[PDB]
Write a protein that binds this ligand. Structure first.
Ligand SMILES: [Zn+2]
Length: 45
């Protein structure tokens, strides 16, 4: 797949196929696909 733009829409959801205008909104959607999490355990103290 080739977009074809020197530089437009720096924030998009190519994972599923859905462009976005907001950077904070796309981060909540695009993330919905690539799920990852596993903070460290409770350290002493
Ligand atoms: Zn998406």
């Amino acid at each position: 797949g080739s977009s074809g733009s020197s530089g437009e829409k720096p924030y998009s959801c190519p994972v599923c196929g859905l462009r976005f205008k907001r950077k904070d909104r796309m981060s909540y959607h695009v993330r919905s696909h690539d799920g990852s999490v596993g903070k460290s355990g409770p350290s002493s103290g």
